[PDB]
Structure formats: structure tokens, C-alpha cells
């Protein structure tokens, strides 16, 4: 809607979206635009906001400027950072395995106070990775994403925990800064046994001021009488020896100990977030310390208002660490900023110390400055960092959700098990900010979540949600983004409420949300703000589930997670019954080609599409064609426009992998039958029409990248060549001159791709091997064969080859002369064992595929494509799949509502000019505004061709199917329809492994698991339990001796099987022999003793 080329998809929504979905990728962009602070960001803060915008780079540069040593004789000032144009293009970087970056330059001022001179030198900091249009980075050739982190904002937070000992109330406070030791009420830096009064004496305040300021506090006066510390300098000593035990103090050290720990800005960093949090709630100095104690006192007394000298009255109440007001997000720009600061603080150390031992006046910004730690921070962050991740692209949706994801893990936050389960629980303030429905199913539940649809990030790191403020029972067009803090202050009217003419509250009472949150009513007089629309709380993936309101959160969470697991098909058909997001999410993903200027198409080719703008300017777009994605899915694009077509700015020129005509297509529409069928679909299994194979409806393409290098060996140089030491001339049939597989060839498991050979060292051939060499006259070759072959159980066609040679300049790491990459692709037909599913959380493997001949088939003769079992449907609490199964049939055959007389009663409040739709027309039911049960039934009866004028489905959504085997009708009416099902990235070809013998681990002789190593299965503790429960000793022993760890036994058993002899007796597990050795290395003497035979040796 309001998209120039948007296809026509009729909606049942009874509301009107007052605010378009904001750009979904903004969260990733704005953060980076702030860091680099380009002009697009400058204008933002200037128009409305601060008048001194500071880019993240400048912000961290102001901290370093200037540099000065203890003498303060020399100072080095930094300023004016600058970026050049990007080194290479993204397409070039992903090709050459480099990183997309713009070099950075700075102004380095070096001032000598004694000589009063100036050395100004342009400094090169390094290549600074740049963010793409899609919000990603190219790091060493692979596309990556930096996920935003959830952390507790620095501030003062109090908690009340009851002590079982006294069975009475107790109050504890904590202050968490940006950096530096943390204090808790004294409890300071994990040092307990502290009299919070004694530190107020450490500052030097006399006891008189304690009775003055404490005032009404009873324990305030009683504790100072309990403390035996007399004097301000003696309390600084009682605080000194516990904080620095083992170091005798001094009057110079004892006093600066307290000031340098907190008051000093160097070791205690005032946080812009922390400085703002407490400044309103009450860098550091005294005013903050005494304010916290006074805040704590009133909290234990029970007064809700606290005031002190020269301060604003604020409520005294406990704080919620899980309330989004005190919990903020660290956006990519900030996560980058922090890692730059770490690099400068490490360079500052080399800058300061370099001044001392360097010859004065012979030093320059270049000599003092060493950027090794600065670039290491950036390079070390984009790799190996938990928040910098390989982008997940199965489909445009999977990638778009990766960005927008927020997590509580990683450095700087609670990690893994440490986090309590209370955090995972959804808070009332997650509304419209973090989607409650979308999270992981596993151990990560609730720690990872996706930003909501209309949610927006604040420059301070707090999520804001859009609202429409209402005044005097009238909702204006004013839209105000509010942080969680200011939301609880007001009352939130419900998104859907009866609207009155030019607008006003029509209903007698209005739904409302309180700060509890609490749900209550009023007459509409007291409401302030109302929701922008339904599905504020929902995320993009969640909003794409038709009939979301009907499905339980359990099966919905499974539904969202499984959309991101889909795979692009060859045909990529769009959903027949959709929601609003399908089109808007595809364009914001970046996998679709959009036109940025109004104009006309000059040319259309599979290769590229060119448009002639009204401006006279000329834009062109190169189409990604069969580009292997990160996980192997096919990225191919196709042009949707013709030559003469007119187009408008922001239209869709070509489809992405999973998109059709601009909207996300994650699967196909299929004819469904809900009857249980001959036990073949049972326990979630599914059956398919063989049509889905012959017609390639579920077919999808997958591409692999194989790599081999020729390096310099201490014994020679590796050479890529067609000559192999021992091979048939046939095995080389598909190799070219150089020894690389010829493009377009077919490859089978074990087939050669790139022939390579490495030098050998003194061979000492077996005498039996030398005799044959003389007989058949094949001279023993000087080089062993190390050659790239296709992995086990993998096959396909050769698409393209990429060769990087040393002879040719190129670039390679030291020692690597030649590197060749071969790309193999294959068409994967839908196969039994593959995993399919719908948007509602219903998932199952393909149990069987039947000939189109014998299938439940309508009176038309039209076989149903899929048969889903009836039993798992009712108990799992996802009934949306049935609804969209009925509507899926509605949209397919069309319909006409009766024009006889007026409009039937079921249409009273209902669709606008939806009374008729042709056959195959697409429908959209926004999640919470979508179609309603009444309107469904009314549509169930509806237009009835197939070709002849007979109805194929009743008003109950049922039909009489004919068994394709016996040929007789099924006794009862069966529900049929069209359902939207997705193909999922779990495939049998990848998941099927088998091993007889193979590689063994080095230290331990066991077979090394994983398909890459051709390894075997793990028979574990629990399995050995079951084996023991059965009482089978020989089965158990066999698994743990001659089938894994027995070096002599495994080779004998093979010998025995090949000769048809009896399998021998097992030996000693090599792992156990290693145990005795590892125990001996601990100075434990472990002797294996015979009955009477004393010591035994293992050799």
C-alpha cells in the first residue's frame, strides 16, 4: 500500500494505519552514521536537538585530547578525523576476501611547553570498516552483522530483600558506573565489614554534620555512635588497609586513594547515561554520595518523597533492573566506539612513555604514535567478537531479522548461565519495543529478542515506541515517540477503539494501560496517548503469521523461528493468504532491486536492468545471479519489468530470492487434506503429491565452495597440476591442463576437483612395493598426492572457478603461491525426509510421496498435494492453520457475496468492496485486525466454477475425496483447501551419515565425529547405561574397544571380516592407557597388578 508497484492484495483490516512502518534497517544505520557522524546525521541533530553534534569518533577523540605527561612539559592534541573514499567495492571485496573499509586520517599536534614549538603531522590511523546499504559489513570477504546488546544503564538502583535471620526488611543499594570500582551499601570493591558512616569521615566531615544531615534517620545516628573510628584521617586508614592489604600507607597515598578511585575522572568514568540517570533521580564528587545515603534512609523509613539541601523532590522507591527504563541497548555505533577507546588507551600508554626515553624535540606525532593497538581493536572486534556475527541469510527474512536482533549476552553483560530466569520473563514495558513472541526455543529463551515493528532507538540507548496522543476524548494526528520511563507516566488507550467521525472517543469507556502495568477504564476523558496501531508489540517475522491472534504463543514462537529457516525456491511463489508485512519487509531486506528515480526502462537483460530517468540521468542495476549465500542458499534475482515500462521512485525492478512482485514468498501454496491417510502421515509426518517433484514446485538450488591452496613447503613448492602420482587416465578425464575441473562438468563423491601435488621426503619404499615398480616399470614418483576431491555424499555441477596465482600478481599470504576456488551447485528436488512447515508452528518431515494417480482427489479429478494428520492439530492450540486453509481455498476459487436485497448481516461491520474477488486473487489479514470468524463462514459458500459450474467445497470447508487406490469415495466429508507451507533448511542429503572405517583422532585413537571428518557416532554415558540395563556385555565391550579405541583390535576385526574368519578378542582401550600416563604425570603411581603377579606393563 502506497508503494508505486505494490501488487493488489485485499485486506480485512477495519482500522487505518496512521503511521507507515518505519524503515526496519534504521537501527543498524543511524548507529553507524552517528559513529562516523556524516552530514546525513549532522542535519538530524541540528534541525531539532543539540547544537553541537559530536560524532562517535570525535567524542572518543575529545577524551584523548590532549596528551600530557606528569611533567606536563609536552602535550599532543588530536582533532579533525577524516575518511577517504572506500578502497574497493563490496562486490570486489567479497570476491577478493578483503574487508570493506575507508582509510582514516587525523590531526596530531605535538607541543613542547619549554620550547613552545608545534609539530603538525597528518596521521594515518588505519582502514576503518564501513557499513553497507544493507546495514552489514564485509570482514575478510564474508558479510557480517553486529548485533545490539542489552545492558543495565549506569545509575543508582536500590532493592529490598527480606532476611530470613531477622525475618525483617533490609535495603541494599548499588551504583554501577561506566568504569571503575563499584560500591554497595559499606561494601566497596568486594571488601565487606564496612561502616558506611566511617567513609563520610574519610572525606573529613565532622560528626556534627552527621547529626545535622542525618536528621530523622535513627540508624544514621546509632551507627556513628557504634563506630570506634575517631578522626577523618584515621577512618581513611581503616578504609586503606582493607582496600590495599599488604601496603603500608602514607598521608599522601591515603587521601588521594579515595579521590583517585572515584572523584578522579581517569579511573572513575562519568557515563553520559549514568550522569543523566542519577542527576534527575537525585561527575561524582560528594553531592552524589551523600544523596544516595539520604535516598536509602528514606526508603527504609517508608517516605515516598525525599528532599535535601539544594535539590529537587523525587519519589523514594525501589527500582526494577528489568524495566526498560533502566535497561538500555548498545547499538553498533557504540559497540564500535567502545572498542576504539580501548585501542587509544593502549596507544596513550605508548605515547606517554615514548616521550620519556625518546630524544626531546626529535619526537613527532608519527614517532610518539603507534597504531598497532588501535587497528588491532577494530580487527579483533569484527572477528572473534560475539556481537559481530556471520550474517544469517537463508532468505531475505532470515537476514533482515538478524539485524534488529537485541541480546543480553556478550562482553559487558551477564553471560550465559549467570543470568537469572527473572530477566527472561517478559516485562510490561516490552510492549511495542521488544517482541515477546519471537525468541529462541533453547537455553537462550528470553535473552535474545527482535526489535518491534515501530520501535525506535534513542541517542542514549533506550528504545522508544510511537504513540498518538489523545486530548479530551479526541485522538490527534500528533505522534510522539516515548521512552519506557515517560510511558508509565501516562495512560495508553488501545489501538482499536470505536472512531467517531472527524474523530473522538465513541465508546462509553476506553481500554487503558497503567504503570503497573494495570488495565482499567475511564469515560475517555482521562486518556492521554493511544496506540499507533495493532501489532506494536509484534516483530516483523511475528507480524507475518496470518491469524496470529488464534495461535498460542508456544506454537507462534515456533512459527516465527521457522520462517527464518526457510529456503529460496526456484519458482518463489508468494503467499495466497498473507498479512500486511509481506511486501514492506521484502524491500527493506535489501535482497530486492528498487528504483531510486522515476523514469523508463532502456534495457532489460538477465545480466542488468537500465532505467532512463525523467532527470535525463541514467541508473543501472547489475542482477545477482546464482550467488551462493552464506549458508548455501541461492541468491538469484529476476527482472519483473519489461522494456517500455514506466516506473516510479521506490518501485520493484526485480525479485529477490524469496520475493515475488515485491512481497516475501517463503513457500508455496498447496492443496491440503486434513484426513489421516493409511498411517503414512502419523505423529507429524506428511505425504506429498509426486506432482511437487515433476513440476519443481518445492525444488531449490544449493551451492558449495571448495578451496585448495599451493604453498611453499620446506621440501619444495606445492604445484597445482594435472599429473597425479598413481591414477587412471580416466579419473583425469574432466580435468583441464592446469589440473582443475572443467566448468560445466558433473562431480561425484570422491571425484577430483583441483589436482595438487606436494614434495616428498626420503621414501624408503617397501620391498614388495619396489619389486612391482621394476616389473611394470612405473618409476616411483618424487611427490605425494594431496588433491582436492569432492566431499563424501555430495554431488552437483561445476558452476564457476576462481584462481588466484602468485605468478599473476594478485595477493596471497606469505608462502601461498596459488589459490583456486571451485563452486558446485545442485538442484534439490523435494524428497522424503525433508522438513516442511507452515507459519503457525506446525512442522513435519515428508513421510511419503505418492503418484498423482493414487491420491485423495476432489470430484474434479484434482489430486490434493499434501495430506496432514488430524490428531496433532487440536491439541497443539494452533488453529490458524485450519483458518488459512479455508481462506486459502477462498482466495483460490474466488467468490461473490450476495447482492440480492442488501448486504448479509455477517458483512455489517465488514469488508469494504471485498464483496467480490476473481479466482486466484491474493488476500491479506493483518494479525490483530484481520478477518473474523463470521466473515469466514459467509465466504465459505462462494463462486463455483472449476470449469463446469459445480461447487468443489461446501460452507464447512469440506469435500468428498476419492481414494486413488481403491477408487471409492471416502465415507465422510474431508476438509480441503490451500495452505502456505515453507521448505526448511534441514535436508536429508546433508543429515545422512554413515561410517565403517575412517580417520582417527591423534592423541586419542577414537574416530573423530562430524561429517567433515567422515566420523562415527558417539556412544555415550546414557547409551552405555541402556546397554548395561539389557545385560549385554559383549555388545558393550565391542563398542568401546574394537570399534573405537583398540589400535590393534580394529585392524584385526577388519582383517577378520574380509577373510570371513571369527572376530578376534578385544584389546586394551588406548584411551585407558593414556589415563595411566596422565595420572603418572601428576606424581600418582598407578600400577596395574595381576592376581598374584604384582606389576604389569603396557607396551
Amino acid at each position: 500500500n502506497s508503494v508505486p508497484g505494490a501488487p493488489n492484495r485485499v485486506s480485512f483490516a477495519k482500522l487505518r494505519e496512521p503511521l507507515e512502518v518505519p524503515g526496519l534497517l534504521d537501527v543498524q544505520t543511524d548507529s553507524f552514521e552517528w559513529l562516523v557522524g556524516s552530514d546525513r546525521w549532522r542535519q538530524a541533530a541540528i534541525d531539532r536537538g543539540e547544537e553541537n553534534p559530536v560524532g562517535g569518533l570525535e567524542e572518543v577523540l575529545a577524551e584523548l585530547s590532549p596528551i600530557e605527561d606528569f611533567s606536563g612539559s609536552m602535550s599532543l592534541s588530536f582533532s579533525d578525523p577524516r575518511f577517504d573514499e572506500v578502497k574497493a567495492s563490496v562486490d570486489e571485496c567479497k570476491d577478493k576476501d578483503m574487508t570493506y573499509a575507508a582509510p582514516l586520517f587525523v590531526t596530531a599536534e605535538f607541543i613542547n611547553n619549554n620550547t613552545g614549538e608545534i609539530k603538525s603531522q597528518t596521521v594515518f590511523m588505519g582502514d576503518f570498516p564501513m557499513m553497507t546499504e544493507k546495514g552489514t559489513f564485509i570482514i575478510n570477504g564474508t558479510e557480517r552483522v553486529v548485533v545490539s546488546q542489552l545492558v543495565r544503564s549506569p545509575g543508582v538502583y536500590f532493592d529490598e530483600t527480606i532476611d530470613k535471620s531477622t525475618e525483617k526488611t533490609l535495603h541494599s543499594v548499588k551504583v554501577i558506573p561506566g568504569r571503575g570500582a563499584w560500591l554497595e551499601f559499606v561494601r566497596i570493591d568486594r571488601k565487606r565489614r564496612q561502616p558506611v558512616t566511617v567513609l563520610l569521615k574519610a572525606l573529613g566531615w565532622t560528626n556534627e554534620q552527621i547529626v545535622e544531615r542525618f536528621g530523622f534517620s535513627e540508624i544514621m545516628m546509632g551507627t556513628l555512635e557504634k563506630d570506634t573510628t575517631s578522626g577523618t584521617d584515621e577512618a581513611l586508614l581503616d578504609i586503606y588497609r582493607k582496600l590495599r592489604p599488604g601496603e603500608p600507607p602514607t598521608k599522601e597515598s591515603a587521601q588521594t586513594l579515595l579521590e583517585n578511585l572515584f572523584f578522579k575522572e581517569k579511573r572513575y568514568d562519568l557515563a553520559r547515561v549514568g550522569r543523566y540517570k542519577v542527576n534527575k533521580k537525585l561527575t561524582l564528587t560528594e553531592e552524589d554520595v551523600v544523596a544516595t545515603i539520604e535516598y536509602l534512609v528514606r526508603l527504609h523509613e517508608g517516605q515516598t518523597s525525599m528532599t535535601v539541601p539544594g535539590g529537587v523532590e523525587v519519589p523514594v522507591e525501589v527500582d526494577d533492573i528489568d524495566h526498560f527504563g533502566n535497561r538500555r541497548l548498545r547499538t553498533v555505533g557504540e559497540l564500535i566506539q567502545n572498542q576504539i577507546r580501548v585501542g587509544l588507551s593502549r596507544m596513550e600508554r605508548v605515547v606517554r612513555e615514548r616521550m620519556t626515553t625518546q630524544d626531546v624535540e626529535a619526537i613527532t606525532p608519527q614517532t610518539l604514535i603507534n597504531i598497532r593497538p588501535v587497528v588491532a581493536a577494530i580487527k579483533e572486534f569484527f572477528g572473534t567478537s560475539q556481537l559481530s556475527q556471520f550474517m544469517d541469510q537463508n532468505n531475505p527474512l532470515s537476514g533482515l531479522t538478524h539485524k534488529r536482533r537485541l541480546s543480553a549476552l556478550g562482553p559487558g553483560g551477564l553471560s550465559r548461565e549467570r543470568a537469572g530466569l527473572e530477566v527472561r520473563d517478559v516485562h510490561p514495558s516490552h510492549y511495542g519495543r521488544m517482541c515477546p513472541i519471537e525468541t529462541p526455543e533453547g537455553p537462550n529463551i528470553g535473552l535474545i529478542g527482535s526489535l518491534s515493528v515501530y520501535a525506535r532507538v534513542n541517542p542514549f540507548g533506550f528504545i522508544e515506541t510511537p504513540y498518538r496522543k489523545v486530548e479530551n476524548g479526541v485522538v490527534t494526528d500528533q505522534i510522539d515517540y516515548l521512552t519506557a520511563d515517560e510511558e508509565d507516566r501516562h495512560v495508553v488507550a488501545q489501538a482499536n477503539s470505536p472512531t467517531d467521525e472527524n474523530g473522538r472517543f465513541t465508546e462509553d469507556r476506553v481500554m487503558v494501560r497503567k504503570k503497573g502495568g494495570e488495565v482499567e477504564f475511564v469515560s475517555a476523558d482521562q486518556v492521554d496517548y493511544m496506540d499507533v496501531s495493532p501489532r506494536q508489540m509484534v516483530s516483523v517475522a511475528t507480524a507475518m503469521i496470518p491469524f496470529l491472534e488464534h495461535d498460542d504463543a508456544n506454537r507462534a514462537l515456533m512459527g516465527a523461528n521457522m520462517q527464518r529457516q526457510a529456503v529460496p525456491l526456484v519458482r518463489s511463489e508468494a503467499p495466497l493468504v498473507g498479512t500486511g508485512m509481506e511486501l514492506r519487509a521484502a524491500i527493506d531486506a535489501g535482497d530486492v532491486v528498487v528504483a531510486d528515480k522515476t523514469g523508463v526502462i532502456e534495457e532489460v537483460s538477465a545480466d542488468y536492468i537500465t532505467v532512463m530517468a525523467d532527470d535525463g540521468t541514467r541508473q543501472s542495476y547489475r542482477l545477482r545471479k546464482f550467488a551462493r549465500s552464506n549458508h548455501g542458499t541461492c541468491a538469484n534475482q529476476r527482472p519483473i519489468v519489461d522494456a517500455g515500462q514506466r516506473v516510479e521512485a521506490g518501485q520493484v525492478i526485480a525479485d529477490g530470492p524469496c520475493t515475488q512482485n515485491g512481497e516475501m514468498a517463503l513457500g508455496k501454496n498447496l492443496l491440503v487434506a486434513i484426513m489421516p491417510w493409511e498411517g503414512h502421515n502419523y505423529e507429524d509426518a506428511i505425504i506429498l503429491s509426486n506432482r511437487l517433484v515433476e513440476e519443481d514446485v518445492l525444488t531449490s538450488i544449493h551451492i558449495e565452495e571448495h578451496e585448495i591452496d599451493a604453498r611453499d613447503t620446506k621440501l619444495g613448492a606445492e604445484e597445482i597440476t594435472r599429473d597425479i602420482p598413481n591414477v587412471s587416465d580416466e579419473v583425469l578425464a574432466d580435468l583441464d591442463e592446469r589440473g582443475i575441473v572443467r566448468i560445466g562438468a558433473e562431480v561425484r563423491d570422491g571425484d577430483i576437483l583441483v589436482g595438487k601435488v606436494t614434495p616428498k621426503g626420503e621414501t624408503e619404499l617397501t620391498p614388495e612395493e619396489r619389486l612391482l615398480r621394476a616389473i611394470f616399470g612405473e618409476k616411483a614418483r618424487e611427490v605425494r598426492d594431496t588433491s582436492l576431491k569432492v566431499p563424501h555424499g555430495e554431488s552437483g555441477k561445476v558452476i564457476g572457478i576462481r584462481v588466484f596465482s602468485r605468478e599473476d600478481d594478485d595477493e596471497l599470504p606469505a608462502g601461498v603461491n596459488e589459490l583456486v576456488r571451485v563452486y558446485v551447485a545442485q538442484k534439490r528436488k523435494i524428497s522424503d525426509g525433508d522438513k516442511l512447515a507452515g507459519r503457525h508452528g506446525n512442522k513435519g518431515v515428508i513421510g511419503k510421496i505418492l503418484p498423482v494417480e493414487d491420491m485423495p482427489f476432489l470430484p474434479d479429478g484434482t489430486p490434493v498435494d499434501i495430506i496432514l494428520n488430524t490428531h496433532g492439530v487440536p491439541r497443539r492450540m494452533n488453529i490458524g492453520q485450519i483458518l488459512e486453509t479455508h481462506l486459502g481455498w477462498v482466495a483460490k476459487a474466488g467468490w461473490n457475496i450476495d447482492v440480492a436485497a442488501g448486504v448479509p448481516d455477517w458483512a455489517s461491520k465488514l469488508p469494504e468492496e471485498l464483496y467480490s474477488a476473481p479466482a486466484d486473487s491474493t488476500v491479506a489479514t493483518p494479525v490483530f485486525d484481520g478477518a473474523q470468524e463470521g466473515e469466514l463462514a459467509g465466504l465459505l459458500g462462494s463462486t463455483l466454477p472449476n470449469r463446469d459450474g459445480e461447487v468443489m467445497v461446501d460452507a464447512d470447508g469440506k469435500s468428498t475425496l476419492f481414494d486413488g487406490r481403491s477408487g471409492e469415495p471416502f465415507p465422510y466429508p474431508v476438509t480441503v483447501g490451500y495452505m502456505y507451507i515453507l521448505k526448511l533448511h534441514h535436508l536429508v542429503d546433508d543429515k545422512i551419515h554413515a561410517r565403517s572405517t575412517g580417520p582417527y583422532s591423534m592423541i586419542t585413537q577414537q574416530p573423530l565425529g562430524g561429517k567433515a571428518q567422515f566420523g562415527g557416532q558417539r556412544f555415550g554415558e546414557m547409551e552405555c547405561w541402556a546397554m548395561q540395563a539389557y545385560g549385554a556385555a559383549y555388545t558393550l565391550q565391542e563398542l568401546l574397544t574394537i570399534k573405537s579405541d583398540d589400535t590393534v583390535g580394529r585392524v584385526k576385526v577388519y582383517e577378520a571380516i574380509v577373510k570371513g574368519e571369527n572376530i578376534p578378542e578385544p584389546g586394551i582401550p588406548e584411551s585407558f592407557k593414556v589415563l595411566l600416563k596422565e595420572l603418572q604425570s601428576l606424581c600418582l603411581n598407578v600400577e596395574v597388578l595381576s592376581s598374584d603377579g604384582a606389576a604389569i606393563e603396557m607396551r
Partner: protein, 95 residues
């Protein structure tokens, strides 16, 4: 054998540790930076732990299985299977 009656532990005395040891490793050296061969008297020294290649002494004067269990008077490495490299222990004499 595969059948043993008892398996016993006890504090290892400095004498036991010395009896186990086939030699004292005197240097914190893994392998040569050029030839990538084991450095003598260091960790991995073939003179102590054992040969890298079966029936092959460090220098190679005796390369053949003809004489097993003889030590090369030059490099001091015993001629036997490299499996002993996994079975043998050294020791360090503390000052």
C-alpha cells in the same frame, strides 16, 4: 592381557619419577625454527622420548629394522617404532 586383578595408586616418590624417566629434559625448546625437527635435550628430544620415524635415528646412520633396540652412537636415539614416543616419560631435576 586384558585381565588384571587390582589397580592401585600411591604417592609417587622422586625416585619412582626418576625410574620412569628415560632422561632429563634440560631445555625449554620444542623444535628448530628452520628444519622443524625436535631440538635435542628439549621437550620432544628424540634422544629421550623416542624416534619420530619408525626404526630411524635422528641422524639416520641406522635406518633399518635389521637392528632393533640399538642406540646410535652419534645422535643417541634408539631404533624402534615411534609408538614409544607416546609411551615414554621424561623428568626435570629441580634445584
Amino acid at each position: 592381557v586384558n585381565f588384571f586383578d587390582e589397580l592401585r595408586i600411591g604417592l609417587a616418590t622422586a625416585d619412582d619419577i626418576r625410574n620412569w624417566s628415560y632422561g632429563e629434559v634440560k631445555k625449554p625448546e620444542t623444535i628448530n625454527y628452520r628444519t622443524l625437527k625436535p631440538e635435542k635435550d628439549g621437550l620432544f628430544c628424540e634422544k629421550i622420548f623416542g624416534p619420530t620415524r619408525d626404526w630411524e635415528c635422528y641422524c639416520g646412520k641406522y635406518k633399518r629394522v635389521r637392528f632393533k633396540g640399538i642406540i646410535c652412537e652419534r645422535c643417541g636415539v634408539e631404533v624402534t617404532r615411534a609408538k614409544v614416543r607416546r609411551e615414554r616419560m621424561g623428568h626435570i631435576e629441580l634445584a
